[PDB]
RNA sequence: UAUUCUCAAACUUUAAAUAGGUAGGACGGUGCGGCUGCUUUGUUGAGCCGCACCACGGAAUCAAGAGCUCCAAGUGGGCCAUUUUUGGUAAGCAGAACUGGCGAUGCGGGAUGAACCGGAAGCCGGGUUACGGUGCCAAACUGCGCGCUAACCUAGAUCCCACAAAGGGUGUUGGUCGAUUAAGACAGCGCCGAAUCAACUAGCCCCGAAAAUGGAUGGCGCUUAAGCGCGCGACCUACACCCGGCCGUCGGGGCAAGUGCCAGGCCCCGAUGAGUAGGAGGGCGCGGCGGUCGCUGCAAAACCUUGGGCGCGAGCCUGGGCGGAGCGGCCGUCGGUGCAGAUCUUGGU
């Protein structure tokens, strides 16, 4: 007994019931993933500020 | 104009006194949809 | 009812004549027709000649 | 993976422009990128390193990191019922400085100048620009009128250049 | 004052049209700045 | 006096630009039930024949044309092109009426009746008042008679109004010519 | 060598429409000073940090408001439609894209129908419409107008839709291009006398057109149509729109030196009402327990009744009868607590 394989029918309606949610952007963003050397220097500068 | 217009609740008009011609067609083709320019006034008379 | 109404003329005679001439010219151009000479293959059918 | 390779369906997207292949102009490597800059992602098909995924091609994002050869870009991506700020690293060859905010600073400066002038003369003004509105009335000089009429039909002219 | 203004605007428009005709040219009326919009279809089967 | 079809002279031009400070002004004589539809058809023709759209065009003037003497009979000729189920064709027709508006209404009705051509499938190329001697159709030429005489062959029997209408009558109608 | 007919999902210089991304300030700008182990030949830059000043809110429209978190149900067979579209001769076939719909949804129209058209809904009065209609069935004209058709085939009669083609017609109705003609057009006898010949085009009609119970424009019928194409007025018709009444829900407001209140109350003001699976709130009903207030041989429970009334409802109160010994209201609390189904169990019919 074969069945349907795939479809995107009704998915946009589901997404729009509560979406499309845009996360609130804060003034300061996380520094994870940035150049480690630059972050090290910035931390030292803040320490001696 | 913006503040005054927003202050006005959307007007709840009655059904046209004389009916409509055809709402599935543009006013240009003899229907009712679209810009009917100065002739909207008579429709308003019949709808108010 | 009294039939004693005044004879009021807002526009003087010369300007009234000018207005009438302008209106007549405007009507003349309003009812004017094209010469239909651009359709050479249909000159006989259109009655130009 | 899962039925589609990394560069699947990129025959046209990742190809280079006609008669624009070969060496890359030096202007690409002389650009300056800084945090907060808006950039456009345009994949150069000749640079196979630091290539963004095809999805990010043709999308504009903001710079959040600056390495030796690449720049970090944050690009919005819609996944079902929310928008994800996906952070990627892309080589400068694949990125171009965006003009999406070129007029902002100019407009702000002019608004500040106009507001200062209005305050000097003791007036209150709005510096907001407005959409094009209706034009006022005007007089048009009469000229020779050319009459337009419908064209008599001729079947021989139904073909481009005639039958 | 508003009633007087409305009458004056109507008279001015008529006079402008007449003067344009007299001069042999055309007067283009100012484009409408205001519209009244009436919904004529129901709320069933609506596109987003 | 109400006519279904009115004749308008619509005047318009392309929006002035730097290249064209004074663009060519175009005029048309059009038939429509309203001035709004007349302007719509004017812009349709301008777009199709002169490459001037309504969006980048200017409306200058629109005036109704009324018959000079609606109290007298005239012969009207109409040159038109219409679309059939299988193509386009040209057609010349003649009518007799007191006004050209009535002649145009007759033309629309006759096209609908004889060729099943809807109103939007008909384009009017030319109109003119034809003298009696220059008429080409026998239908119009048959009433060019100084002494025209015929009986009323078909007359419908009805009361002056529905006030006097009755379901039953004592005698059958008495008809004669 | 210069031309030329015709082409591409896995060709392409060029290249739309629709759709995709970004930005349009209070997380801004300007001027000084400071931190660094990073960077520079270079306090050269890069970030960050303090001080001082400015910043009419920096496009439109809307904003029945915005954000965040926890626990959890059901679902994980779908199907249909315009447009795009793959395999297949095709399928009421099989498979994809966007959107909508049915499923879960009644209501008016399409005779009839899950999907078409209209339109979505608390209980009512009045008015007006949507789609569709106004010869009867059947509410509204045999209304006012113009042409076409005559079916000796069951003429024809309204999106989906309940099919018809290529070829034809000297049936009839309009148009297009040609030829002859009052120095006389064509047929019959040089007489005779005013129209004649030919090809295309497309409306209606006809041929093309054969199946099994008797029968389907829905039926009857309809031809100065009640058929076909196009108009004009006036009418009919939804649970849709407008005004009013009432019920519920949601939101807002008023009420204390309290003449002051089931404040868990009363009063006032706006908007609004579809619901399967599923969730929740407030209530109705049964049998015990802890308390409290009562009824009953001057007749309890149970049962019976075209007696009566209250509540939207679950139910409740009561007249009358029968019965002949117990029973109920209220506040808490508890449970083997509510049946139309299960080829359900037992008994009875
Ligand atoms: K599940
Ligand atoms: K025929
Ligand atoms: K008790
Ligand atoms: K009882
Ligand atoms: K209890
Ligand atoms: Mg309303
Ligand atoms: Mg539709
Ligand atoms: Mg696409
Ligand atoms: Mg619909
Ligand atoms: Mg009602
Ligand atoms: Mg029927
Ligand atoms: Mg028990």
3-class DSSP state for residue D82? strand
- Output the CA torsion D23→D26→D32→D35 (10° steps): 0
C-alpha of D157 from chain center: 43
CA of D37 to C1' of G23 (A): 12
CA dist D156 → B47, C39, C40, D152, E39 (Å): 52, 14, 14, 12, 47
Tokens of D116: 């200062």
Given its phi and psi angles, is residue F56 left (phi above 0), alpha (psi -120 to 50 degrees) or beta? Answer: alpha
Q: Is any Cβ of chain C less than 8 angstroms from the Cβ of E26?
A: no
3-class DSSP state for residue F96? strand
- Output the CA torsion D140→D143→D149→D155 (10° steps): -110
Residue linked to tokens 């009323």: F152
Instruction: For E32, name the nearest residue in chain D, comparing CA atoms only.
Output: D134
Closest CA of chain D from A38, distance in Å: 10
Beta-carbon contacts of F161 under 8 Å, excluding residues fewer than 6 positions away, are none
Residues 18-37 of B with CB under 8 A from E: 20, 23, 32-33
CA dist F162 → A19, F158, F166, F167 (Å): 66, 9, 8, 11
Instruction: For C28, name the nearest residue in chain F, comparing CA atoms only.
Output: F65
D146 with F24: Cβ contact below 8 A: yes
Phi, psi for A5 (deg, rounded to 5): -100, -40
3-class DSSP state for residue A16? helix
| Cα E25 to middle of ligand 8, angstroms | 51
Name which of D52, D66, D49 is nearest A35 in CA terms: D66
Beta-carbon contacts of D93 under 8 Å, excluding residues fewer than 6 positions away, are D24, D28, D29, D44, D47, D50
| Residue ranges near ligand 6 (ion) with Cβ within 5 Å | B 12
Name which of F106, F97, F103, F94 is nearest F137 in CA terms: F94
Residue linked to tokens 């003369």: D121
Closest CA of chain F from C25, distance in Å: 14
3-class DSSP state for residue E18? helix
CA angle F129, C42, F10 (to 5 degrees): 55
Q: Do D and F count as touching (3 or more CB pairs closer than 8 A)?
A: yes
Beta-carbon contacts of D70 under 8 Å, excluding residues fewer than 6 positions away, are D50, D89, D90, D91, D92
Cα F39 from Cα F11, distance rounded (Å): 9
Instruction: For B33, name the nearest residue in chain E, comparing CA atoms only.
Output: E40
Strand segments (E) across chain D: 38-41, 60-66, 70-79, 82-91, 95-97, 138-140, 145-147
C34 with D152: Cβ contact below 8 A: no
Residues of D in contact with E20 (CB under 8 A): 139
Residue in D66, D81, D85 closest to A18 by CB: D81
Residues 2-41 of B with CB under 8 A from F: 27-30, 35-37, 39
Contact D81, A18 (CB under 8 A): yes
CA angle D61, D63, D67 (to 5 degrees): 135
B13 with E38: Cβ contact below 8 A: yes
Residue F52: half-sphere exposure toward Cβ, Cα within 13 Å: 22
Cα F126 from Cα F81, distance rounded (Å): 10
End-to-end alpha-carbon separation of chain B, Å? Answer: 23
Name which of D25, D37, D145, D158 is nearest D93 in CA terms: D25
Tell me the count of D-F CB pairs closer than 8 A. 46
Tokens of F123: 């384009």
Q: Is any Cβ of chain A less than 8 angstroms from the Cβ of D83?
A: yes
Contact D102, D66 (CB under 8 A): no
3-class DSSP state for residue B25? coil
Cα F103 from Cα F80, distance rounded (Å): 13
- Say if strands E26-28 and D138-140 run parallel, antiparallel, or are unpaired: antiparallel
Cα C24 from Cα C18, distance rounded (Å): 10
DSSP secondary structure letter of residue D77: E
Q: Do B and F count as touching (3 or more CB pairs closer than 8 A)?
A: yes
Beta-carbon contacts of D53 under 8 Å, excluding residues fewer than 6 positions away, are D6, D88
User: Which helix (H) or strand (E) covers residue E8, if one does?
Assistant: helix E2-23
Residue D36: half-sphere exposure toward Cβ, Cα within 13 Å: 3
Residue in B20, B33, B40 closest to E36 by CB: B40
Tokens of F129: 């008042």
Closest CA of chain D from A30, distance in Å: 10
Cα E12 from Cα D116, distance rounded (Å): 39
Contact F36, B28 (CB under 8 A): yes
Instruction: For C31, name the nearest residue in chain F, comparing CA atoms only.
Output: F65
CA of F65 to C1' of G61 (A): 42
Tell me the count of C-F CB pairs closer than 8 A. 23
| Cα D133 to middle of ligand 12, angstroms | 82
- Output the CA torsion D17→D23→D26→D27 (10° steps): 0
End-to-end alpha-carbon separation of chain E, Å? Answer: 46
Q: B12 exposed, middle or buried (CB, 10 Å; 0-12, 13-18, 19+)?
A: exposed
C32 with D147: Cβ contact below 8 A: yes
Residue in A18, A20, A34 closest to D83 by CB: A20
């Amino acid at each position: 007994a074969k069945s349907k394989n795939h479809t995107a029918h009704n998915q946009s309606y589901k997404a729009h019931r509560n979406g499309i949610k845009k996360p609130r952007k804060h003034r300061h963003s996380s520094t994870k993933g940035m150049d480690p050397k630059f972050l090290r220097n910035q931390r030292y500068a803040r320490k001696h500020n | 104009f913006k503040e005054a217009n927003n202050f006005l609740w959307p007007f709840q008009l009655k059904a046209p006194l004389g009916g409509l011609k055809k709402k599935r067609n543009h006013y240009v083709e003899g229907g009712d949809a679209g810009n009917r320019e100065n002739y909207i006034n008579e429709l308003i008379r019949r709808m108010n | 009812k009294e039939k004693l109404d005044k004879k009021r003329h807002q526009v003087t005679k010369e300007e009234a004549s000018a207005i009438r001439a302008a209106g007549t010219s405007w009507f003349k151009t309003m009812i004017s027709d094209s010469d239909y000479t651009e359709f050479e293959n249909f000159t006989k059918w259109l009655g130009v000649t | 993976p899962a039925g589609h390779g990394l560069r699947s369906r990129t025959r046209d997207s990742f190809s280079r422009a006609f008669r624009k292949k070969g060496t890359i102009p030096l202007s690409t490597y002389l650009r300056i990128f800084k945090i907060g800059d808006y950039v456009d992602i345009k994949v150069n098909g000749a640079i196979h390193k630091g290539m963004p995924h095809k999805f990010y091609h043709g999308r504009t994002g903001r710079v959040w990191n600056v390495t030796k050869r690449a720049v970090g870009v944050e690009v919005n991506k819609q996944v079902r019922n929310k928008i994800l700020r996906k952070r990627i690293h892309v080589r400068i060859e694949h990125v171009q400085l965006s003009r999406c905010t070129e007029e902002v600073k100019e407009r702000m400066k002019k608004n500040d100048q106009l507001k200062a002038e209005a305050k000097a003369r003791g007036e209150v003004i709005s510096t907001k620009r407005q959409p094009v509105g209706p034009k006022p009335g005007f007089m048009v000089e009469g000229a020779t009128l050319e009459t337009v009429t419908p064209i008599p039909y001729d079947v021989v002219n139904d073909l481009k250049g005639g039958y | 004052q508003y009633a007087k203004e409305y009458e004056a605007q109507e008279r001015e428009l008529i006079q402008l049209k007449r003067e344009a005709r007299l001069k042999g040219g055309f007067y283009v009326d100012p484009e409408a700045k205001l519209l009244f919009i009436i919904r004529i279809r129901g709320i069933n089967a609506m596109a987003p | 006096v109400t006519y279904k079809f009115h004749q308008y002279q619509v005047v318009g031009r392309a929006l002035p630009t730097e290249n064209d400070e004074h663009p060519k002004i175009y005029r048309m004589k059009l038939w429509a039930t309203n001035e709004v539809r007349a302007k719509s058809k004017f812009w349709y023709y301008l777009r199709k024949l002169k490459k001037v759209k309504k969006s980048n065009g200017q409306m200058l003037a629109i005036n109704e044309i009324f018959e000079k003497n609606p109290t007298k009979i005239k012969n009207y000729g109409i040159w038109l092109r219409y679309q059939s189920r299988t193509g386009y064709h040209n057609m010349y027709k003649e009518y007799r009426d007191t006004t050209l508006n009535g002649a145009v209404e007759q033309m629309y009705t006759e096209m609908a009746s004889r060729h099943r051509v809807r109103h939007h499938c008909i384009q009017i190329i030319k109109t003119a008042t034809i003298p009696a001697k220059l008429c080409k159709r026998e239908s119009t030429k048959q009433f060019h008679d100084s002494k025209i005489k015929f009986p009323l062959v078909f007359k419908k029997v009805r009361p002056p109004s529905r006030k006097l209408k009755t379901t039953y009558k004592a005698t059958r109608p008495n008809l004669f010519m």
